[model samples]
Target chain A: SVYDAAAQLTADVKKDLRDSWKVIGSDKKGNGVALMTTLFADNQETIGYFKRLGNVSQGMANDKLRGHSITLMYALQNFIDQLDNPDDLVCVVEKFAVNHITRKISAAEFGKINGPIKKVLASKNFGDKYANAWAKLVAVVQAAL
Target chain B: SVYDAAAQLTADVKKDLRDSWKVIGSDKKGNGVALMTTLFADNQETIGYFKRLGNVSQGMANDKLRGHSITLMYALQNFIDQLDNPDDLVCVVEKFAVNHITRKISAAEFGKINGPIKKVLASKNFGDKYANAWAKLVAVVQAAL
Candidate 1:
């Protein structure tokens, strides 16, 4: 029963994420940077973690920020795409986790990203239910990290 | 014993097909047109099957040819990617098949492109084992068409 409930939650989360992406528009590069901008503004110290964004101010447009945005969106898209395939999803997340580890990124830092992103999605009318679903998925993924 | 042999054959086929693709390189757009060019050159009559390429001559590279090449490669890539998942593979092929039917394409015509493409792969040292695998997969897809 617990497994079933978790599965249902994952499915709902996928649906909500997909729905929210529609609001953010398909310019993942643009949306990713905007999300990152909010995260940097909220947790100013975390901006130091990014080598390219180290000297860039919040809401400042920079090529490196755009590049980072594209990279993040790609990782997120791959993760979302494989949500239904736990093994495949784990494979992608594992690779991402390993990469982040090399950059000295902690699991908590990765988890911290969800707040601003969810806020952005909600502002675009993504709603609370979907945001909560997203949080649940992110927790499972972070625990494995 | 028969069923087991068939299963083993399908596995090898998938593997070989994937191996061959690796040699083609991941320039999907470029590789797509190159393969299409060989097909049109080898089977001149088959050009009549395409509404977009019907009047276009080989080597007269244009947008329609490029567009068709991209579409075909995408379908091929999807089919190859899902070879292990027959259900998903079938879904991709079935959707492609429906689209081709609307364009007045035939199963026979679809099967015809394989010869030239296989020749190109073999020329690239793609080998017979995997080419045969490709044939088997294509046969099932063609039958659906």
Candidate 2:
């Protein structure tokens, strides 16, 4: 029952994130760039795993990053929005887990991203309760992967 | 040569409208409600033609109106975005026109909607130039219908 409460909290936090996203600028590509910027800043080593993002300093990888970022956000939104509908959430996460496997993205690497992402969410001062909710959701994602 | 200029103008106007839409709030269903409200205010008799929206006072048809409005705007954006590509514009407009025919929506009834729609755009002070561009695009839609 407590876990279910956390799941619902994740949905509320997602709505807050989405509202702020529209205010900050709803450009999917731009949002993706910002996310990747934070991800790299948090852990430069993570970039090494991304074959397409080779030579991150070259700046040419941004377009590819933007595309992936948007795709990733869309997938995340699907999961967050359907938190109450576990079957729907499972379907989406399972589909993306398969996609990630094909791309050679290991579950461990995916797990690493959760910290940076939660930091970003925490920046908005959504409170630890929200962050905890996100962690629970992330755990589900990592487990599915 | 003239056709090219019109196409360019349509692209420019589309950009202006989209910018204003973002400012006024880019919530598709909300914007649709605003547009439909204006259309009805400008001409109450027009409601008779919308079988689903019969007697707008009923308030029972808003959900249907919202769906149609979103669909209409999406089709309009497709036409605006592909202004330089007549073949693509024709295909989108042809598909919508056929859909309208199936619902017994005459071109005249559809054409009557342009003035009110333009008024909504004009309120944003995008200027007559963009309005003229929109009129040109709307003419093609009407002709197809």
Candidate 3:
């Protein structure tokens, strides 16, 4: 509970994280879907919480699920961009938490995406330093959530 | 050439569009994917322009394409949210135009989505008036592009 979005995501880290993402290019939604797909595969636990609207379940071919995954990327992209001012970043992530209150959201649930994210960063040969940077950002987001 | 994102969108229209969007629930991304899905099915020309990265085709089941479609919805959601301040909205829309210069993007290419968009709004019984509000929003986004 000691995690602070701004404190943990420092200037050098933010700049490097922002720049590091360029290699992934601007196809953020695609990248997001890629991440979400992996998250679903590696972590079925998340599927339960996300798939539910009033009730339960979610999909890839399904535009509804696809779009939802894409929205996470949208959230991720803004998180990085907002790193210039992590206060705004904090505000943005918390807004998601507001809507996310429907289920028993936990670090346990959001943390599932971390495995997928770590796997994706490794695929880029991003190294543990960069990999941790990504995790650190996600950690803050998880905190904000 | 006469399109004005700020001018045409107007104050009352912005409020109505924002309020009306509430009915669709907070699933903006899903709704966006839904609209974009209809756009792709109804307007194939858009797919050709959108699918190409440096060159090529696109897919639905493909997370890449689905995510891209979701991003368009992301764009659409912001377009509606940004209506609160069209001056910034003007700046925001034009930024997409900057990144969009890679392809032979035109009003013709962007306009193709209108048919798909119109159909979705009509399904909501949005009527001509509401449908026009949606169109005018797209019109400005296209112009900004």
Share of reference contacts found in each model: 0.00, 0.00, 0.03
lDDT of candidate 3 over A38-133, digit per residue (tens): 876877656666543222233344444444554455566656655765444555566555445545676556666667777777777777777778
Question: Residue A31 in candidate 2 has what lDDT?
Answer: 52
Order of quality (DockQ): 3, 2, 1
* Alpha carbon lDDT of each predicted model: 0.63, 0.57, 0.60
Write candidate 2's Cα lDDT for B15-125 as tens digits: 765565454434444455667777778877777667654455533244455445544454554555455556445545565566677777777887777776677666666
Query: Could you tell which candidate, 1 or 2, scores higher by DockQ?
Result: 2
True contacts kept of 2: 0.00
Ranking 1 against 2 by TM-score, winner: 1
lDDT of 3 at B85: 57
Q: Sort every candidate by TM-score, greatest first.
A: 3, 1, 2
Better of 1 and 2 by lDDT: 1
DockQ of each: 0.02, 0.03, 0.04
User: Clashing residue pairs in candidate 1, if any?
Assistant: none
Off by over 4 Å in 3: A1-3, A52-60, B1-135, B138-145
Candidate 2 reaches a DockQ of 0.03
Evaluate model 1 with DockQ and give the value: 0.02
